[PDB]
Amino acid sequence: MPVLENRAAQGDITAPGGARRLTGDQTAALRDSLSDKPAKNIILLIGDGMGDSEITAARNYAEGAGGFFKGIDALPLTGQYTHYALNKKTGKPDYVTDSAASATAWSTGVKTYNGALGVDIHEKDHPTILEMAKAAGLATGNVSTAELQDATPAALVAHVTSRKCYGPSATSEKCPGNALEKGGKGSITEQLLNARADVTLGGGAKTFAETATAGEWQGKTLREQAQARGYQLVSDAASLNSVTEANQQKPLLGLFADGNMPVRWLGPKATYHGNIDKPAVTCTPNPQRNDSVPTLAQMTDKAIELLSKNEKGFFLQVEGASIDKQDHAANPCGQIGETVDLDEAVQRALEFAKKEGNTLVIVTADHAHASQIVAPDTKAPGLTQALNTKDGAVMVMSYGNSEEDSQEQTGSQLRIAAYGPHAANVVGLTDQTDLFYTMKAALGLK
Amino acid sequence: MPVLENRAAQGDITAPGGARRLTGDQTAALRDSLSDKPAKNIILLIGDGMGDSEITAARNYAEGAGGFFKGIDALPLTGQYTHYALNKKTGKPDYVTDSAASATAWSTGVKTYNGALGVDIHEKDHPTILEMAKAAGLATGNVSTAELQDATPAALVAHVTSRKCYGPSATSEKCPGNALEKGGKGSITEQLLNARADVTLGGGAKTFAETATAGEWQGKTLREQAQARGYQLVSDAASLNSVTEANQQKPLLGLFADGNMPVRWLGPKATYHGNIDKPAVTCTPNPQRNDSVPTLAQMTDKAIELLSKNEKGFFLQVEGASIDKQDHAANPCGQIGETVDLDEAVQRALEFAKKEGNTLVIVTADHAHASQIVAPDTKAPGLTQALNTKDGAVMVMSYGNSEEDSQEQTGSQLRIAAYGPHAANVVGLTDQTDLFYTMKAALGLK
Ligand SMILES: [Zn+2]
Ligand SMILES: [Zn+2]
Ligand SMILES: [Zn+2]
Ligand SMILES: [Zn+2]
Ligand SMILES: [Zn+2]
Ligand SMILES: [Zn+2]
């Protein structure tokens, strides 16, 4: 089963056939990509807000228009999927989902309302693919560059009526029915500590400083609880590297930042008529990103090494979280740098899958976003910025859908790509909930 | 080789598995969709400006979020393709193409600068797939709802340095080197008359009123020259239906409107804070569309019937032209109606291909566009509008990338879908110029 080794323009862009990305007929290669054998493992990579527009913009900037992302573009089976949410009151579709309803959809197979995690519109709990994988004896990992309490990694291990119920305090106030002291299952962080995935890596150390309002660990901070329940806690790249075993007896919990992990590249925010009034921008590496803080590609590798030891197999979710956050912030460099970061993690995943032979790798996004690539001389009503690309030309990015401080995500269908056993199920038009059923089936979870 | 008969939500949207579009594993069905046999015919359908966002918005409105376009969504092999143009002066990438450079790319296989038709950055001509098909003896058809001189159908039959060179007058002024009287090949309309495709249907009768400045037909209007050169001219549906033969001796030229054919649905223009200040809209059929004017689906059927008689095979291009124009106009209803219109033509094409067995059908767009689907309560800097969808819920559309009277197209990669022999070549990431090579090879044109 081949991965697309090179789909960059084959020659001179200005010449006949020079911009072609293909060098011959693809039929035979697609036939070799088709297999219904069971998958022993699944690696799901999520670019939050990484719709087709975000992928095109990052490619143009970092690899040039005729370039090619060795990870993101290398998946051979591609399709488009819908991710609409539900109106909680009426049950009718809500055309633009947030990260919580969408993460719930692929993780439980049931649509829900914006803001919900692991529950349907009647606030009923539904088991997630991670809980199911664990029940069957598979190793499980949940990796993200965001706070571990954020929507995407939280939907795999928590069931609360509002994504805001990070810890004990917000929960009592916003999710009374889930508040530990009122008899509920607990806050996102508490449920995360109970779910006990084998490998959990990300940011969000802040919330772990809260203290439980009830239960066995009442009065202990969530960090103490974790140590007490036997989790191996690591907080930097060296200690993360030192980990040699991660399992039910010694589950790994890596907290690498108080909030969201540092962004890869810095650049200024887009601005009104910024493509006209200001000079083009060249993104620059964030000095704070650090040799101390593991990258998304490192976390992914370490997670695969550990989850690997399980004979039954594993399920791993990896999230390039800040693509969406920088998109809301109208910051081209933060957004693109996070897309490049994700590509590196996709590459480690593909290398492993390529060798192993029984791993289904999927790369997609939870919803589309605001950024659009427009003509250089565009006079737009929103925020714009001109960037100096790898091609030595200027690309202009526009964010024109919000008068508020945060740009809105969007509802357009977007790319889903896959590689490995059962990858055929992402081709054509599908729904985000289909992804739950594809993964369950691929893994044979009954 | 199967078409996706049904990818609508399988049941109750609010229930587990109810929103799924798949009913079982797709592996076998995909293996059956794979064929490298030669294509006898090719039908290329283009939605101008129909990016994934446009497809999603039209689907939500007309079929409901869990709905499914029987034509557009039924193609089983899908991928994403890049359509960047070149800066004429530098030869570097220009991230946002216009309809002319993009149409040139899939029709000649060479990238070019915005505004160019059938020539590279050096202004050198390159043969089009239609000219090549014709030389090989295949019947050829070029159908559109725009003026026949517009970028999309023009790129198949003309080579001029600027899309604006509609007829004799604009050409002398704008394309001196192509001006007939200055020894050039002629205006778009004149080269169209020379190209002699067997079936040409669309609007743009206006320009045919011009008179040739030179050559055999100097002093005759372009309409006269057509009659003189042997073309069968039809201008309404009944006369179109009466045509029984179309070939090199009796080529058909249908002019159904002075300019662009009428739009299918009417609705108001999007407006500042329109989703907040004004009530939701329900689109309404255009009373002027007429029983007299063939629809795109009718033009397609007729063209297939006539091109069909050719034993060698045929090449047909069909354009749902006004999707792009209504998008520029920030008119949701016009935009959506034109996408539903294209769906019907896709349907006709698929029905024929399905029976015939040797027809490659491709549905894609030339570039992406402005419209975005945003949250209902969005307060945006641009033009917005709330619409009443088939689901009984409201969807909001936003156009926020231009302060001018025309919304800008965008540069995001977008969906390409295909069915039939050689369709595998549209899967994964490809380039718009690869489409030229895919069609030329599928057809065996040497
Ligand atoms: Zn999100
Ligand atoms: Zn997220
Ligand atoms: Zn977001
Ligand atoms: Zn166009
Ligand atoms: Zn067009
Ligand atoms: Zn346009």
- B91's CB contacts (< 8 A; 6+ apart) are A13, A14, B121
Q: Do A53 and B108 touch (CB under 8 A)?
A: no
B384: which DSSP letter?
E
Experimental approach: X-ray
* C-alpha B249, offset from chain centre: 27
**Strands A252-255 and A232-234, bridge-based pairing:** parallel
Q: What is the CA radius of gyration of chain B?
A: 21
B18, B232, B233, B345 from B252: Cα distances, Å: 49, 5, 6, 19
Q: Are A84 and A12 in contact (CB under 8 A)?
A: no
Best CA proximity match to A259, nearest among A316, A347, A184, A322: A322
- Distance in angstroms (rounded) separating the CA atoms of residues A318 and A349: 10
Q: What is the resolution of this structure in A?
A: 2.2
- Distance in angstroms (rounded) separating the CA atoms of residues B336 and A402: 23
Q: Do B422 and A55 touch (CB under 8 A)?
A: no
Q: Do A391 and B92 touch (CB under 8 A)?
A: yes
Does any CB of chain B come closer than 8 Å to the CB of residue A17? yes
Structure tokens at B175: 């394309």
Does any CB of chain B come closer than 8 Å to the CB of residue A249? no
* A83 CA distance to ligand 4 middle (Å): 27
- Distance in angstroms (rounded) separating the CA atoms of residues B46 and B102: 11
Q: Are A373 and B96 in contact (CB under 8 A)?
A: yes
Q: Chain B contacts of A68, Cβ < 8 Å?
A: 429
- Distance in angstroms (rounded) separating the CA atoms of residues A31 and A177: 51
B196, B300, B312, B314 from B305: Cα distances, Å: 18, 9, 14, 11
Does any CB of chain B come closer than 8 Å to the CB of residue A186? no
A399, B338, B380 from B401: Cα distances, Å: 8, 21, 11
Q: Are A117 and A98 in contact (CB under 8 A)?
A: no
- Distance in angstroms (rounded) separating the CA atoms of residues A442 and A434: 12
- Distance in angstroms (rounded) separating the CA atoms of residues A373 and A52: 11
Residues in chain B: 446
Query: Could you say which of B7, B86, B378 has the minimum Cβ distance to residue A13?
Result: B86
- B3's CB contacts (< 8 A; 6+ apart) are B74, B75, B76, B350, B354, B419
Residue type, B349: A
A106, B72, B106, B442 from B434: Cα distances, Å: 34, 21, 7, 12
Give first-to-last CA distance, chain B, whole Å.
26
* Strand partners for B211: B221
**Which ligand lies nearest the alpha carbon of B143?**
5
Among B372, B406, B443, the strongest candidate for a mutation testing the A interface, having the largest count of A CBs within 10 A, is B372
Q: Chain A contacts of B121, Cβ < 8 Å?
A: 14
- Distance in angstroms (rounded) separating the CA atoms of residues B440 and B27: 28
Cβ burial B245-262 (10 Å sphere, 16+ → b, else e)? ebbeeebbbbbbbeebbb
Residue ranges of B 308-327 with Cβ closer than 8 A to chain A: none
Q: Is B156 left (phi over 0), alpha (psi -120 to 50) or beta?
A: alpha
* A256 CA distance to ligand 2 middle (Å): 17
- Distance in angstroms (rounded) separating the CA atoms of residues B301 and B43: 11
CB atoms within 10 A of CB B322: 30
**Helix (H) and strand (E) counts in chain A:** 14, 18
**Which chain B residue has the Cα nearest residue A83?**
B65
Residue type, A359: T
* A152 CA distance to ligand 1 middle (Å): 7
Beta strands in B329-401 (DSSP E): 359-365, 372-374, 383-388, 394-399
B295: which DSSP letter?
P
Q: Are A55 and A335 in contact (CB under 8 A)?
A: no
Best CA proximity match to B152, nearest among B45, B302, B80: B45
* Burial class (CB within 10 angstroms; exposed 0-12, middle 13-18, buried 19+) of B353: buried
Structure tokens at B344: 């019907």
Q: Are A171 and A160 in contact (CB under 8 A)?
A: yes
Does any CB of chain A come closer than 8 Å to the CB of residue B67? no
Beta strands in B83-237 (DSSP E): 85-86, 93-94, 139-147, 199-203, 232-234
Structure tokens at A374: 């427009």
Neighbours of ion ligand 3 (CB under 5 A): A 324, 409
Residue type, B41: N
- Nearest chain B CA: its distance from A298 CA (Å): 27
Q: Do B422 and A392 touch (CB under 8 A)?
A: no
- Distance in angstroms (rounded) separating the CA atoms of residues B21 and B8: 5
Q: Chain B contacts of A388, Cβ < 8 Å?
A: none
Q: Are A281 and A388 in contact (CB under 8 A)?
A: yes
- Distance in angstroms (rounded) separating the CA atoms of residues A360 and A439: 9
Among B4, B327, B387, B408, the strongest candidate for a mutation testing the A interface, having the largest count of A CBs within 10 A, is B408
* Strand partners for B201: B143, B254
Among B23, B26, B406, the strongest candidate for a mutation testing the A interface, having the largest count of A CBs within 10 A, is B26
Best CA proximity match to A17, nearest among B362, B126, B38, B368: B126
Q: Are A72 and A346 in contact (CB under 8 A)?
A: yes
Catalytic residues of A: 99
3-class DSSP state for residue B44?
A: strand
Structure tokens at A170: 């917000």
- B299's CB contacts (< 8 A; 6+ apart) are B143, B201, B202, B240, B254, B318, B345
CA dihedral A184, A186, A187, A189 (to 10 degrees): -170
Q: Do B78 and A35 touch (CB under 8 A)?
A: no
Structure tokens at B355: 């029976």
Does any CB of chain A come closer than 8 Å to the CB of residue B10? no
Tokens 């693509």 appear where? A323
Best CA proximity match to A317, nearest among A29, A114, A70, A41: A41
Residue A190 has, within 13 A of its CA and on its CB side, a CA count of: 28
Residues in chain A: 446
3-class DSSP state for residue B203?
A: strand
Residue A135 has, within 13 A of its CA and on its CB side, a CA count of: 11
Residue type, B53: S
Structure tokens at B423: 């369709």
* C-alpha B12, offset from chain centre: 35
Query: For B415, phi and psi rounded to 5 degrees?
Result: -55, 140
Residue type, B83: H
DSSP structure string for B72-127? TT---EEEEEE--EE-TTT--EESS--HHHHHHHHHHS----TT-BSB-TT--B--
The dihedral through the CA atoms of B7, B22, A117, A410 has a sign that is negative
Give first-to-last CA distance, chain A, whole Å.
26
Query: For A30, phi and psi rounded to 5 degrees?
Result: -75, -35
- Distance in angstroms (rounded) separating the CA atoms of residues B232 and B254: 8
Q: Are B279 and B386 in contact (CB under 8 A)?
A: yes
Q: Which ranges constitute the DSSP H helices of B369-431?
A: none
Show the domains of chain B with their CATH numbers. 1-446 (3.40.720.10)
Residue A205 has, within 13 A of its CA and on its CB side, a CA count of: 12
CB atoms within 10 A of CB A137: 11
- Distance in angstroms (rounded) separating the CA atoms of residues B143 and A86: 40
CB atoms within 10 A of CB A65: 29
Q: Are B369 and A344 in contact (CB under 8 A)?
A: no
B127, B227, B367 from B104: Cα distances, Å: 10, 29, 12
Helix axis angle, B332-356 to B52-63, nearest 10°: 90
* Strand partners for B142: B200, B317
Q: Are A59 and A409 in contact (CB under 8 A)?
A: no
Structure tokens at B59: 């689907």
Among A68, A104, A372, A430, the strongest candidate for a mutation testing the B interface, having the largest count of B CBs within 10 A, is A372
* Strand partners for B383: B272, B399
Residue ranges of B 47-66 with Cβ closer than 8 A to chain A: 51-53, 55-57, 60, 64-66
Best CA proximity match to B349, nearest among B38, B109, B46, B94: B46
- Distance in angstroms (rounded) separating the CA atoms of residues B317 and B360: 12
* B79 CA distance to ligand 4 middle (Å): 19
The dihedral through the CA atoms of A264, A269, A275, A276 has a sign that is negative
Q: What is the CA radius of gyration of chain A?
A: 21
Does any CB of chain A come closer than 8 Å to the CB of residue B37? no
* Strand partners for B387: B281, B395
**Which chain B residue has the Cα nearest residue A68?**
B429
Q: Do A374 and B410 touch (CB under 8 A)?
A: yes
Best CA proximity match to A434, nearest among B342, B11, B257, B136: B11
Q: Are A382 and B370 in contact (CB under 8 A)?
A: no
* Strand partners for B373: B397
- Distance in angstroms (rounded) separating the CA atoms of residues B264 and B85: 31
* Strand partners for A315: A42, A140
DSSP structure string for A245-276? --SSSS-EEEE-SSSSPPPSEE-PPPEETHHH
- Distance in angstroms (rounded) separating the CA atoms of residues B50 and B364: 7
Structure tokens at B317: 């291009």
- Distance in angstroms (rounded) separating the CA atoms of residues B179 and B165: 9
CB atoms within 10 A of CB B88: 18
3-class DSSP state for residue A117?
A: strand
- Distance in angstroms (rounded) separating the CA atoms of residues B347 and B194: 31
Q: Are B306 and B246 in contact (CB under 8 A)?
A: yes
Structure tokens at B87: 């800066």
Best CA proximity match to B99, nearest among B425, B403, B320: B320
Best CA proximity match to A43, nearest among A353, A372, A269, A329: A353
Q: Are A2 and A57 in contact (CB under 8 A)?
A: no
3-class DSSP state for residue A218?
A: strand
Query: Could you say which of A36, A395, A441 has the minimum Cβ distance to residue B95?
Result: A395
Please work out, in degrees rounded to the nearest 5, the angle formed at the alpha carbon of residue B125 by the alpha carbons of B119 and B127: 105
* B97 CA distance to ligand 4 middle (Å): 8
CB atoms within 10 A of CB B95: 29
Q: Between A and B, how many CB-CB pairs are < 8 A?
A: 335
- A300's CB contacts (< 8 A; 6+ apart) are A143, A316, A318, A345, A348, A349
A229: which DSSP letter?
T
Structure tokens at A47: 């670019």
- A100's CB contacts (< 8 A; 6+ apart) are A114, A115, A116, A117, A151, A154, A155, A163
**Helix (H) and strand (E) counts in chain B:** 14, 18
What's the longest Cα–Cα distance across chain B? Answer: 71
Q: Which ranges constitute the DSSP H helices of A113-248?
A: 129-135, 151-154, 168-174, 188-195, 222-228, 237-242
Structure tokens at A43: 């690696």
Cβ burial A16-32 (10 Å sphere, 16+ → b, else e)? bebbbbbeebbbebbee
The dihedral through the CA atoms of B191, B195, B196, B202 has a sign that is negative
Best CA proximity match to B44, nearest among B153, B189, B127, B160: B153
CA dihedral A387, A390, A391, A392 (to 10 degrees): 60
Does any CB of chain B come closer than 8 Å to the CB of residue A178? no
A155, A164, A178, A196, A213 from A169: Cα distances, Å: 19, 10, 11, 22, 9
Q: Are B342 and B44 in contact (CB under 8 A)?
A: no
**Which ligand lies nearest the alpha carbon of A153?**
2
Q: Do A26 and B80 touch (CB under 8 A)?
A: no
CA dihedral A196, A198, A201, A207 (to 10 degrees): 10
Please work out, in degrees rounded to the nearest 5, the angle formed at the alpha carbon of residue A27 by the alpha carbons of B74 and B34: 40
Query: Could you say which of A60, A374, A427 has the minimum Cβ distance to residue B401?
Result: A374
Q: Chain A contacts of B430, Cβ < 8 Å?
A: 7, 21-22
Q: Chain A contacts of B441, Cβ < 8 Å?
A: 25
Residue type, A232: Q
Q: Chain A contacts of B374, Cβ < 8 Å?
A: 96, 401, 408, 410-411
- A190's CB contacts (< 8 A; 6+ apart) are A167, A168, A171, A180, A212, A222
DSSP structure string for A397-432? EEE-S-SSSSPPPB---EEEEEESTTGGGGSEEEEH
Q: Do B401 and A368 touch (CB under 8 A)?
A: no
* B51 CA distance to ligand 5 middle (Å): 13
- Nearest chain B CA: its distance from A429 CA (Å): 6
3-class DSSP state for residue A346?
A: helix
Tokens 């697309």 appear where? A4
- Distance in angstroms (rounded) separating the CA atoms of residues B359 and B316: 11
Does any CB of chain A come closer than 8 Å to the CB of residue B123? no
Tokens 């990669």 appear where? B413
3-class DSSP state for residue A123?
A: coil
- A286's CB contacts (< 8 A; 6+ apart) are A262, A263, A264, A265, A266, A337
- Distance in angstroms (rounded) separating the CA atoms of residues B143 and A10: 32
Tokens 């091609």 appear where? A391
Residue ranges of A 392-431 with Cβ closer than 8 A to chain B: 392-393, 395-396, 398, 400-404, 408, 410-415, 417, 422, 424-425, 427-431
